[PDB]
Design a protein around this ligand. Structure first.
Ligand code: 5HA
Ligand code: CL
Length: 368
């Protein structure tokens, strides 16, 4: 699928986007790729931060749906006007579909001043689509209206780059074997984590903990976010493996940045981290392992701590995704992980995907 290879750009900390076109003739926009949301939504007014925006009056295929949408985030809020128009992805399959568009007419703390994107492509399911499940998401319009197979894969390469392969997989982007975890239910890309090790040390928690109340795969979130009760323990252990050097008790966020002279970065006082994921077969699991490199983000070389808490559940943000090629195999209701060809890896230890493991009572790990 060489046409689609390297079709993502970005800057550290500012997200991964793909170029799309909207309306007739096409208007070109950069659009953030987010697997943790389900609306396609673009700037539609001259917000000053925006390099460009969808100008509906210039498109003959635009059709008004005469309905509004209001999407608060955690911090990031937008409001827009629903319509539909002709959408296409230059570095994607050679098709065009009529999809839903939320013309963003007002927003607070959503756009990033200095970024080079103007929109968001929500790749999750109708169930979490705003205003409600009737608003069909982009990918579902894609598949229903063309021959494009019901699947996509992401390689996010941590100025950033990567690939979104729409409709398939490209073997050039990973090594070894793909391992697959079921999508527990189609709303977010929900999965079940069944064991967590730090440096190989289990945290011997109840595994219902690791998924309280969700575990999810989300390209639109920077961090590995862990549930309150899990975050606490994770922290204690990673803080314990790391006690060669002290650090502010607030830096284990969040609340500060940490620093070492460039090259002085203390890589190894940090443990690799492992999530075991439910496998395809009863009582079988597999693990994904990431480096401190993945969860220590460049912001003198000052890094942030990419793990954090959530009353939301686990969020396998880009901290996770950067180590792997992730295949969203909607057709078979499963997600696949393979070691990424582009992940950042030193010479002492690299990211890994391995199995099979035996693990009992995996069903018991799904919070209900
Ligand atoms: C842009 C940046 N995202 C961020 O840096 C960032 C974004 C979000 C955020 O909420 N992202 C949105 C999409 C969304 C995307 C962009 C703007 C608004 C909404 C996404 O739909 C969230 N999905 C959750 C509802 C399940 C959340 C956080 N976390 C709270 S955090 C501090 O724990 O990591 C960080 C980023 C950087 C690199 C890679 C990916 C994303
Ligand atoms: Cl439609």
């Amino acid at each position: 699928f060489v046409e689609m290879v390297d079709n993502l750009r970005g800057k550290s900390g500012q997200g991964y986007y793909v170029e799309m076109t909207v309306g007739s003739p096409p208007q070109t926009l950069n659009i953030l790729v987010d697997t943790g949301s389900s609306n396609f939504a673009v700037g539609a007014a001259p917000h000053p931060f925006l390099h460009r925006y969808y100008q509906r009056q210039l498109s003959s295929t635009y059709r008004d749906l005469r309905k509004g949408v209001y999407v608060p985030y955690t911090q990031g809020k937008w409001e827009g006007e629903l319509g539909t128009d002709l959408v296409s992805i230059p570095h994607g399959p050679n098709v065009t579909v009529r999809a839903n568009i939320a013309a963003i007419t007002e927003s607070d703390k959503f756009f990033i001043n200095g970024s080079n994107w103007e929109g968001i492509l929500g790749l999750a399911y109708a169930e979490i689509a705003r205003p409600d499940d009737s608003l069909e998401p982009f990918f579902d319009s894609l598949v229903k209206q063309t021959h494009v197979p019901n699947l996509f894969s992401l390689q996010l390469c941590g100025s950033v780059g990567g690939s979104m392969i729409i409709g398939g997989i490209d073997h050039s982007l990973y090594t070894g074997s793909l391992w697959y975890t079921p999508i527990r239910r189609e709303w977010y890309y929900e999965v079940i984590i069944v064991r967590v090790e730090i440096n190989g040390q289990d945290l011997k928690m109840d595994c219902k903990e690791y998924n309280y109340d969700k575990s999810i795969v989300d390209s639109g979130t920077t961090n590995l976010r862990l549930p309150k009760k899990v975050f606490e323990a994770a922290v204690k252990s990673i803080k314990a493996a790391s006690s060669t050097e002290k650090f502010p008790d607030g830096f284990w966020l969040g609340e500060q940045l940490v620093c070492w002279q460039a090259g002085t970065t203390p890589w190894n006082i940090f443990p690799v981290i492992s999530l075991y994921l439910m496998g395809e077969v009863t009582n079988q699991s597999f693990r994904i392992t990431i480096l401190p490199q993945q969860y220590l983000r460049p912001v003198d070389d000052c890094y942030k701590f990419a793990i954090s808490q959530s009353s939301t559940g686990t969020v396998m943000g880009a901290v996770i995704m950067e180590g792997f090629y992730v295949v969203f195999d909607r057709a078979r209701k499963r997600i696949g992980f393979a070691v990424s060809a582009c992940h950042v890896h030193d010479e002492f230890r690299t990211a890994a995907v391995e199995g099979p493991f035996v693990t009992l009572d995996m069903e018991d790990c799904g919070y209900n």
